[PDB]
Amino acid sequence: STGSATTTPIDSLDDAYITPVQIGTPAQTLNLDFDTGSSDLWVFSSETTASEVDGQTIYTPSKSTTAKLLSGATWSISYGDGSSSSGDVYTDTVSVGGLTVTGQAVESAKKVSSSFTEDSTIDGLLGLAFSTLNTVSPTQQKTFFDNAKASLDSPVFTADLGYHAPGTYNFGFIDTTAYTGSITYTAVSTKQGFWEWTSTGYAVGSGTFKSTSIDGIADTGTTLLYLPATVVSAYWAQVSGAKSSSSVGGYVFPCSATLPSFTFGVGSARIVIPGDYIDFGPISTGSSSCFGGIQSSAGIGINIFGDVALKAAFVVFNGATTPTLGFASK
Ligand code: NA
């Protein structure tokens, strides 16, 4: 089997992407944030504290003829941005882009933190990291990918995120029309439950490539590119008037600037992030200070190749017995 679903930016900045997901019988379609940096499929629901729901579409298990309470199971998750959610668990039928899993754990939120309530466009998350990070207690649950894997034509999914445009998540096949050149594969460590890999270096604009190992995760659920402070300083030094602002919480730059590209290495291959991808716009409405899309990972404890990096590539998440990542230009 295979599946193919379009993923759509939630706003004009590509802060996140939403993908429709069919849950239950008859289908309830919710727009989920597919997150390769977490392992829970959780949804706003009929159980969510009413004051914490503001425009989201909710999953109502009582209206699904295939929903079953996973008795005694609870979940609770905290993300890198300080957001959180928790609740109980149902099993149900879940379909993505025509690919169906029966008996998927669907984590029903009783509580969500303010950042979820305030984002009316995201109805929940669908985790695509390794199932070792799933938070369901006392019986850990599998991701949608892990449950689908054995049925797939190939044990892979691909992320093809758009810049200010829709893109695609495919399950079970490589679309050889969706990228240019060849795919370069690189080793993954699953030791922390993430799609963790080592980039071979970087360049700033038309500058020389610096060969240096940068361990990080491929995380579709993180907006920005978080790299070591040396790398990030080197990048922003090439933008007149850019500075790190403790008050704003990262590097800002004059909105009048033209940003340089940023290149990252994947083995001997190179993925170029155009400068425009690094502009996250005014820090507040009408400001002439703009927020940068490359930020320091210092204090986060891991480098994160989030959407700013991933949307410059066609990315293969290879879930074979020895997982690997693939990157192609597109
Ligand atoms: Na922000």
UniProtKB/Swiss-Prot annotation:
Catalytic residue positions: 35, 199
Disulphide bonds in the chain: 255-290
Domain Peptidase A1 residue range list: 17-328
Enzyme class: hydrolase
Gene Ontology biological-process annotations: proteolysis
EC number of the protein: 3.4.23.22
Reaction(s) this enzyme catalyzes, per UniProt: Hydrolysis of proteins with specificity similar to that of pepsin A, prefers hydrophobic residues at P1 and P1', but does not cleave 14-Ala-|-Leu-15 in the B chain of insulin or Z-Glu-Tyr. Clots milk
UniProt GO MF annotations: aspartic-type endopeptidase activity
Superkingdom as given in the UniProt entry: Eukaryota
Alphabetically ordered keywords of this record: Aspartyl protease, Disulfide bond, Hydrolase, Protease, Signal, Zymogen
Assigned protein family: Belongs to the peptidase A1 family.
Name of the molecule in the record: Endothiapepsin
UniProt source species: Cryphonectria parasitica (Chestnut blight fungus)
Upper lineage: Eukaryota, Fungi, Dikarya, Ascomycota, Pezizomycotina
Covered range of the whole protein: 90 to 419 of 419
